[PDB]
């Protein structure tokens, strides 16, 4: 919000867990203690489109994201062209 879908979980470990999703998610930002110690929910999200490939894999244990962003550029949908 403008890209606000929560995939968070609690492990935020990313080995045999989740990577998939065009650019958007440059994480591994180890918070001072959470097991395989890499955490949060995103990096700078003003770049790419609206997947839920975002979970599909590696837990969000609650929801999982999808489209919810509304304010929606174009670069933010393939088609501005």
Q: Which of 32, 34, 43, 71 binds other proteins (CB under 8 A)?
A: 43
- Compute how many other C-beta atoms are within 10 angstroms of the C-beta atom of residue 49: 18
Rounded Cα–Cα distance for residues 78 and 11 (Å): 32
- In this structure, the dihedral spanned by the alpha carbons of residues 53, 59, 64 and 65, taken in order and rounded to 10 degrees, is -50
For 52, half-sphere exposure in the C-beta direction (CA atoms, 13 angstrom radius) is 8
Our finding on whether 36 is near other proteins (CB under 8 A) is no
33 lies in the site for other proteins, by CB under 8 A: no
57 touching other proteins, by CB under 8 A: no
Binding residues (CB under 6 A) for ligand SF4: these are 7-9, 11-14, 17-18, 21-22, 24-25, 45, 48-54, 58-60, 65
Binding residues (CB under 8 A) for other proteins: these are 6, 8, 14, 19, 22-23, 25-30, 38-45, 47-53, 62, 66-67, 75, 77-81
């Amino acid at each position: 919000m403008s890209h606000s879908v929560k995939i968070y979980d609690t492990c935020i470990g990313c080995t045999q867990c989740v990577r998939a999703c065009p650019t958007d998610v440059l994480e591994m930002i180890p918070w001072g203690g959470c097991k395989a110690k890499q955490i949060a929910s995103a990096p700078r999200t003003e770049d790419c489109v609206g997947c839920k490939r975002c979970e599909s894999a590696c837990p969000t244990d609650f929801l999982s994201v999808r489209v919810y962003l509304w304010h929606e550029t174009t670069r933010s949908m393939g088609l501005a062209y």
